[PDB]
């Protein structure tokens, strides 16, 4: 249940936002503000359910949409080689 | 509450040898 980045992934906070770099492939990705917030809270050890609760309490988003959006982001992070399965 | 923008991930580029 623990969200983990792949070992070769580095993170930077920049003026464009949060960036993830794959040190093997050289691919690097920009996360928008919501994606960065989700990833940061998952890396803190919070569950996706925790993060959904946070998003609904802080943003104009329904709980159902928050859960789907978190799940889609995590799936995309795994798809694109940033997060471990 | 804050305006919600759905999470987005964008590939910026690929670092290679020069
Ligand atoms: Zn990789
Ligand atoms: Zn944190
Ligand atoms: Zn928790
Ligand atoms: Zn806040
Ligand atoms: Zn909706
Ligand atoms: Zn909805």
UniProtKB/TrEMBL annotation, chain A:
A molecular function (GO) term: metal ion binding
Cross-referenced InterPro entries: PQQD, PqqD_sf
Residues the record lists as binding Zn(2+) 1: 8, 22
Residues that, per the record, bind Zn(2+) 3: 50
Binding site for Zn(2+) 5: 65
Top-rank taxon, per record: Bacteria
Keywords: Metal-binding, Zinc
Binding-site list for Zn(2+) 4: 58
Binding sites annotated in the UniProt record for Zn(2+) 2: 44
Record-linked NCBIfam families: lasso_PqqD_Strm
Protein name in the entry: Coenzyme PQQ synthesis protein D (PqqD)
UniProt organism field: Thermobifida fusca (strain YX)
Phylogenetic lineage: Bacteria, Bacillati, Actinomycetota, Actinomycetes, Streptosporangiales
């Amino acid at each position: 249940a623990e969200f983990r980045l792949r070992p070769e992934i580095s993170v930077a906070q920049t003026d464009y936002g949060m960036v993830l770099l794959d040190g093997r492939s050289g691919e690097y990705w920009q996360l928008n503000d919501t994606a960065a917030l989700i990833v940061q809270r998952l890396l803190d050890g919070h569950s996706p359910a925790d993060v959904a609760q946070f998003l609904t309490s802080e943003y104009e988003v329904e709980r159902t949409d928050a859960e789907r959006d978190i799940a889609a982001l995590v799936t995309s992070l795994k798809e694109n080689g940033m997060a471990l399965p | 509450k804050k305006k919600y923008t759905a999470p987005q991930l964008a590939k910026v580029g690929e670092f290679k040898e020069a």
